[PDB]
Write an enzyme that holds these catalytic residues in place. Sequence first.
Site, PDB file in Angstrom:
ATOM      1  N   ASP E  21       0.694  -1.299   0.038  1.00 19.44           N
ATOM      2  CA  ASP E  21      -0.013   0.004   0.096  1.00 19.44           C
ATOM      3  C   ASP E  21       0.914   1.176   0.047  1.00 19.44           C
ATOM      4  OD1 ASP E  21      -2.077  -1.618   0.221  1.00 19.44           O
ATOM      5  OD2 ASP E  21      -3.178  -0.668   1.730  1.00 19.44           O
ATOM      6  N   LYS E  78      -8.182   0.947  -5.830  1.00 18.71           N
ATOM      7  CA  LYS E  78      -9.436   0.395  -4.909  1.00 18.71           C
ATOM      8  C   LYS E  78     -10.700   1.261  -5.268  1.00 18.71           C
ATOM      9  CE  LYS E  78      -7.865  -0.934  -0.333  1.00 18.71           C
ATOM     10  NZ  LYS E  78      -6.702  -1.780  -0.653  1.00 18.71           N
TER      11      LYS E  78
END
Lengths: 281, 281, 281, 281, 281, 281
Positions: E21, E78
């Site tokens: 991430d 996302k």
Amino acid sequence: GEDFKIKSGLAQMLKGGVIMDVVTPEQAKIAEKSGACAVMALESIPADMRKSGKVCRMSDPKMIKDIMNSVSIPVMAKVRIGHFVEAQIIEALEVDYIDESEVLTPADWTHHIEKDKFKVPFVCGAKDLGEALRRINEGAAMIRTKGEAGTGDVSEAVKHIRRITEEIKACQQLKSEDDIAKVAEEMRVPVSLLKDVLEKGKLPVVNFAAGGVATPADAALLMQLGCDGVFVGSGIFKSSNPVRLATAVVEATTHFDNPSKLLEVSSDLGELMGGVSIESI
Amino acid sequence: GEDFKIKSGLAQMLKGGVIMDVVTPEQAKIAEKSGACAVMALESIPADMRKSGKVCRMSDPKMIKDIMNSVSIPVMAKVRIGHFVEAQIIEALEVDYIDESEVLTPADWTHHIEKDKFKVPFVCGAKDLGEALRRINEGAAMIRTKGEAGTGDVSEAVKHIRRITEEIKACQQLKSEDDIAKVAEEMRVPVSLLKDVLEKGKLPVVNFAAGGVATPADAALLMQLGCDGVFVGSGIFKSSNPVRLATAVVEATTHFDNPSKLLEVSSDLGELMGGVSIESI
Amino acid sequence: GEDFKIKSGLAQMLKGGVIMDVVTPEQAKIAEKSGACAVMALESIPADMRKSGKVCRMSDPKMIKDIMNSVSIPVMAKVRIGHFVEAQIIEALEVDYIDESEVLTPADWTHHIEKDKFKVPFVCGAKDLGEALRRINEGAAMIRTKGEAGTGDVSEAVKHIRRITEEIKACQQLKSEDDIAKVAEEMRVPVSLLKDVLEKGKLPVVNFAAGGVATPADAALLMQLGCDGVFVGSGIFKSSNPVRLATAVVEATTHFDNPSKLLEVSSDLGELMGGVSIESI
Amino acid sequence: GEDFKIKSGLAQMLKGGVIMDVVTPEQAKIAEKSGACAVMALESIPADMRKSGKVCRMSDPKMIKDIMNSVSIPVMAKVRIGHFVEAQIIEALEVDYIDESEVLTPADWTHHIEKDKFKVPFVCGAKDLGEALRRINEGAAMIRTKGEAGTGDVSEAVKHIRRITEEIKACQQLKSEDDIAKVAEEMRVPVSLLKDVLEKGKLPVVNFAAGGVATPADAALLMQLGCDGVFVGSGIFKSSNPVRLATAVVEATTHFDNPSKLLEVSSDLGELMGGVSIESI
Amino acid sequence: GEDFKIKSGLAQMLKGGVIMDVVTPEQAKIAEKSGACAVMALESIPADMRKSGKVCRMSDPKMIKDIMNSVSIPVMAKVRIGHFVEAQIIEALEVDYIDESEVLTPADWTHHIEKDKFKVPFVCGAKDLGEALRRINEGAAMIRTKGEAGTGDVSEAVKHIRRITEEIKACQQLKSEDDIAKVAEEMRVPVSLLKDVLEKGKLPVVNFAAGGVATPADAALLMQLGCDGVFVGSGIFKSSNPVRLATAVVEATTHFDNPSKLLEVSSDLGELMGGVSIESI
Amino acid sequence: GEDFKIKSGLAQMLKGGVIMDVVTPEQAKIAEKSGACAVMALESIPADMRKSGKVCRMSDPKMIKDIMNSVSIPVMAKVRIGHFVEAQIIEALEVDYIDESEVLTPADWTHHIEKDKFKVPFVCGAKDLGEALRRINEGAAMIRTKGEAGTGDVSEAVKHIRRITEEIKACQQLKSEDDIAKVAEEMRVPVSLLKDVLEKGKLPVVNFAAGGVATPADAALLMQLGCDGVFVGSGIFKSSNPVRLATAVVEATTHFDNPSKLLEVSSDLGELMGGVSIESI
């Protein structure tokens, strides 16, 4: 058998001792020189972890290597329940005893570690016969009472050893090969263990006391009660005069039946950690 | 019989007296000079422990030795419920009376101490006949009402003595050897005790009042009610003019039936500890 | 009879008056000079005790002696429910009326005082006929409504007197000697009392109003409603201009049927204690 | 008949008007000059009392006398439910209308005032036919909706008038002398009232709107809905530009069917009191 | 078949890798140089979003474009569950993998995305076989365990993979074409999938671990457990020495069976993010 | 019919547009110049009102007049549910569309407005077919989804349109004239509507999306989903760069099927209002 008996032996070889929670080499040295039969290396302390409430993990090796490079006596370390890889990493480290400790944040809520597959001796918590047997049947070399870790309260630790002793016995003086067969299946364990227990009246492994030991008095209370040895952890070091208290407990554990001696070592001890009374949980 | 009747005797010999909670030698001397029949040595005070809520343990011997080396009158000390080793350590100390006190953090939620195995007289709390008998049958030399310790509220203490007196009596004027047999088994005690009670209309031991005594008036109320003596503890010392209040209570306890005298000693007493009304719990 | 009627007489002799809660002699003098038929000596005030929540006890005699040595009119004092020794100590003090007041912390949750055994007249709270009778049957010379003390709210006080009047009456116009027999046993009282009540349509003792009187208007409302007299306590003194309000209430109580006069005394009264509306409890 | 029809007349004579809550003469004069048909004198404001939560009582006469001595238009005042003496004191004061207002702390949770015994006209809250009738049967000269006082929210006020109108009607178009007989007994009222209502399709008294009126829009909404007049109280005065809003509401109430006019008076009104949305209670 | 087997291939090609991430390019470059097989671009971090609790949405493209313009390795992003247009916007962006991530605020509580209609490979969370199959049957190219994202706790992630493996197997060694037919309908999925699974003993797609990976030890634990690769996200970067930890994890993931190596990379790692122990949720 | 079809026409004439919540003329101008098909004048903002929690009312005309005097495009305004007089006042104002908006504090919990009696077109919220039909049958010219206003979360808005579309359809492909008759009575609406719907497969009015639209992406998602147009309100203006976002949404709404275009307008948008995730309500 052969492989097991060797593990049990190392553990069994700790009888009558006191293991101490150490956070730093300084602390480690104090513990060795106090009479500790071993030390539990960890970077953060039972009585603090139970407040955080952050994830409590295996401790960083460097940290441990250091602690274990500054003392002759053996060194234990902790891993999370079910976290076999953490354990793998610590067998590798060449630590002496591993403790699959429920005081850390579990890693598998469903499966403990397959301690059989390891050559290092494990230690595990139990609050009752079944639990004890399951951990042993699982490859546990050594066993300790759970008790309420960090609380400073014996209520629990004692209750456990009572139950185990009470249970071992209750189940013992009962009748039928089938009667037993049931209890073995119930507590999910081979008939052969429950059996060696009843035939010997005691677990095959050493049963230490842990969680809630704050005073020499407490330690002694737990031996009189049947335990084979004592885990203290901080707050020996969260006390006013650690060195003194540390020794008091080691001494109290060896002479646990010497009112005169016990009292001698329980005097001018200073202010001890302010526990948190179980009840008030 | 013999061994006990000696313990009973030491306890029985305090009839009519007032035992006082002391925290320091200075406080002890004040109590002695005030007319206290004995003092309870402890490092922290009922009315504070019930707020902490930290683990409350046996007090440090040095602390006690000191308190008990600065007064002629006998000295009591406290141990946790079921903590037999703590007691062992205090027999050794040569304290006069031990009090297995429920005001500290219990050590066994299931088993009290085996006071029989000790030579020092024990004192125990009870709120009802059964509980009383169980503690006595367990080796208790002396008994006191429990009441809400530290509250400053008699409501409880009184209620207890009432019940015990009410129960002793109720059970007393009942009929059959089997009728009794039941009640003995129920309250888990030998038929022989329940019996000596009914045959004597009173416990075999001295029954003091404890927990919730703050005023001379209170003390007197509890004797008029049947008690054999009075435990006060702080906040005599948590009051404005301890020395005066201390004496007032000792005096109020001896002359507990002298309205004229009682009142005399209840005047210009100063500000007493602000209790915590049971109700508001 | 003879002994009782004398007690009732002293109480009965207070009809139409206003009793006032006093905390200090200064306050006592103000109250006498205001028209108070008597004063209630206490060291701490209903409206504060109901917040503490500390144990509220009989007040220190010196305190009372002083208050009662600075006024001609009689002086009442308070004792905890069931605390007979407290009462004994105050008969001794030579106070005029004792009030077994439920506003203090009770001493016996099961037994009130045996007021018969005393020669001083007692006053007791009731919220209904039964309770009233039980207290009277217990030796109560005088009776007052309970109401929510310290709240400043009449809602309660009034409701009680209504009920008692409603109950006395309801039970009154009913039929059978057995019908009554039941109600007597129910409210745990001799058939002879319930009976004198029905035969007279009113208790044998004076019935004052207490708890929740803050305005002259309120006082009057309670007399119009049937009461025989009024207990005010602080916050007359917790008001802006006590002296004035005190008089207003005494005057409002005597002329409780004089709209013209009532209003006259209800003007420019200043700011009164900010009660706590029952509802919002 | 006669006596009442005079009281009704004083009330009935306020048809189409707006009554305003005033706290001070200054406020009263503003209200009068704005077109208010009358003012409600009170020392503390609905929107504040419902937060206190102190006991809210009849207001001090001087206060009222002053307010009522500085305006030509009639003056109302409040008394607590069931507090007949408070009312007596205000008849005496020569106020114009009395309001047995449930917004103050009630004095009798069981009995309202016996308004019949008074010569001054009373006003009472109702949320439904029964309640309305009970108050009227009790001597109520005038009636208003209850609504959530101080909230600033019409939701309630409206709902009430809807129900009353809905109920009057529902019950109206039903069948049998016995059918009615029941409903009369149910809502605890003489068959004769329920009857005059059905025979007239409306209560015998004026029905104003109260509680939750904050905007001219609201006022108009309630007349369109059937009310005979409007109680506003603060926060007209809790608004940014009272004088303007006051007039807007008086004007909005007279011309409650003049979209053009309504809108004209609803512009540049400023910031009004921030109510408390019923829902969020 | 054909179209999918290409998407599968891109996913399948990441076997053995670690996705990281990233919040900024600087962070991306660190991740790439560490050995990350890819990076997940997002403007705010799992461990912060789960506290906010603000709506968490697709991240701003510019943000992503930047991150994806500063690294060779592929880049994921996302989108909210069910938010097909968000996905459409990101196919357009030419991102490599899309993750319909339940860690953001869902957009449809009833319908996931129709990932079939897209040409970019999707990744989806599952906690069990059914859920896994439903997402796959829905067009999911890749699958990951859910686990408690941002907690720092493996307990969950592990438990999932265990269950899936446990379930795949349980269902596998069962009997009848009808027996299966049921389970297919139950978990709302074509018999053909459940079938390819049983016939292959594993999902048709790659199954990574995500949520709760904080230590190299953890990563390794999850591969030993069966996973095909690892999602870490911050707090790698919420740690003391990211660069080092990042590498440790990548290395720990490739050599996940090298106790010696594992330990080597687990030393002197510094202070890691203070997780939030699942239990204490 | 004739009267209705004209109303529907005005509403119908807004197809494909975006209506924007404006608080001030400045804001109005920005909105017009951005491509907004209309603006909703209000003095306080959905995302603030849902926290207050003060009564939210019709907005002050002056306020609106101003906003509506500074833009060519039509102007909507809000009134409380059931508050017909508020509506009357706004027809008068010559506003273009009225919105009986459930986001303000309702005025009748039982009755909506009789929108038939008005000549201005109304807009109403619905979460399902029934509700939709009831509002339409009630005179609603236009309909919008409710969704959680001010939250910034589409979850709701979408779910609604799904349901309506799902319901219209479900009910549609069902069988009997009686089958329908029931559903009409159930959702309390004339058989004739439910019928025109089924015969046309869509409501007779325009169905916009409202509540929870924060991103261009969201807007587009709702059109793809079936809506006829979009209500955004603040926090367009609660965003970093309103002007830009405003345009983005207008553009995203017209080209809601242009992934390339959509993405173009979703880049470098700045920081948008931090919503409040439904879930965390």
